[PDB]
């Protein structure tokens, strides 16, 4: 059965079904609450190369959605746009009533191609994609989300800045996936799994100020050296 949390004396206990306690008091349905908590609060990796490896494609399982009434401010949020090599779309369109996560600091927008097996993209660890007050089990196309879980509670008787970071991934869904951070329609930077979003913004600023942007009609991909960490090579 679904556990129910009881808060008393500023302490949280799991309700016991067989043992009937009389101390706890319920007065109205206003006390019952559902809260969604982000996975990043548990100290897990949040960058795109490590985050995108927790999602896998499957077929033969219908999706399910359950609502929640309160959430937590998310520092990292994701937005996916994946297409098959022939040109078809992988992720389904967002149904009516589904909206992106309301409070996101950095929105990682990833667009690319992959084999796209199966039909729906599930979470390998069994978590939920939170969305806007509607936690689902699959990923929808073009809608911002955030990994997290849901808990049910009995409550006791008693500014906003959004920044979008754009990526480009090749081989999405496989073990050999190549990621590229985008600073311009022609200039890219090779992406490693140790760059915080602020570091990527600083790299963009350095690219723009130092005049390393592509001047020809082709593509230019920079590679940052590991030791000095400030002199981009190629």
């Amino acid at each position, epitope marked *: 059965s679904i556990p129910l949390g009881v808060i008393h004396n500023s302490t949280l206990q799991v309700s016991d079904v067989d043992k009937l306690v009389c101390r706890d008091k319920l007065s109205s349905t206003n006390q019952l609450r559902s809260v969604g908590l982000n996975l990043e609060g548990n100290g897990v990796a949040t960058d795109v190369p490590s985050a995108t490896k927790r999602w896998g494609f499957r077929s033969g399982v219908p999706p399910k959605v359950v609502n929640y009434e309160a959430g937590e401010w998310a520092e990292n949020c994701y937005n996916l*746009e994946i*297409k*098959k*090599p*022939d*040109g*078809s*779309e992988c992720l389904p369109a967002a149904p009516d009533g589904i909206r992106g996560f309301p409070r996101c600091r950095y929105v990682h927008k990833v*667009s*690319g*191609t*992959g*084999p796209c097996a199966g039909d729906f993209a599930f979470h390998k660890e069994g978590a939920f994609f939170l969305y806007d007050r509607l936690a689902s089990t699959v990923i929808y196309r073009g809608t911002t989300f955030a990994e997290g879980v849901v808990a049910f509670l009995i409550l006791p008787q008693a500014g906003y800045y959004s920044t979008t970071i754009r990526y*480009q991934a*090749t*081989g999405f869904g496989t073990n050999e996936t190549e990621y590229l951070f985008e600073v311009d329609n022609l200039t*890219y930077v090779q992406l490693e799994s140790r760059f915080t979003p602020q570091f990527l913004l600083q790299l963009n600023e350095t690219i723009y100020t130092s005049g390393k942007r592509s001047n*020809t*009609t*082709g*593509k*230019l*991909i920079w590679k940052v050296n590991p030791e000095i960490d400030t002199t981009i090579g*190629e």
Partner: antibody
Amino acid sequence: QEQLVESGGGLVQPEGSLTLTCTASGFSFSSNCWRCWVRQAPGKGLEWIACVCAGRSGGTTYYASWAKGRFTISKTSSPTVTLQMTSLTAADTATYFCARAGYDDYGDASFFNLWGPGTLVTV
Amino acid sequence: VVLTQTASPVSTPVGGTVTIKCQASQNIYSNLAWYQQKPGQPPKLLIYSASTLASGVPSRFKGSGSGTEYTLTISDLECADAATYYCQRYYYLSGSADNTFGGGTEVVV
């Protein structure tokens, strides 16, 4: 700026062999690494032959169904890429182009944005 | 996949719009590229993704269409705009590298 000059081509007897060389200059070879060959018979439409990911380790070589075994593209570390033809039948007389693939927001695709002048092959 | 173009020596007086249609045998999810080839010179890319203008291309050309039918429209016609036009379907290099060209439609000024 960017040039894709090609070398080779001319008059060769049937059931022969010939090698074409594509030289590239003026752009980042490691970044734009896909190079393809396109054939156009005199007065007819274009036709894809083969592609190669020259400029970085790994990659893949993609061939066409009609041109299998008779043609072979070579992975040269230098920007120059060679295409070797064998058993040149009388229908192979055409103009050959060395082209560089383009890219879109979702990655590199098969459409070509830079072309070479084209070399003649007569059998 | 087979692509059917207008397939006619289209003639249009200077200043008028000329439209070319490139029908396909199935849905291609807007994966068409429009090329212009003058006699003797190698082809030049004009349109990719059926809507995006290539770099250094005048805004006179426009592309539209989706599904199995796509169109290329030249709003203003000049003397230089007299060459053969092609439409190709392309794949992404992550998977296959198949590329299928059209037939070719010449334009008479």
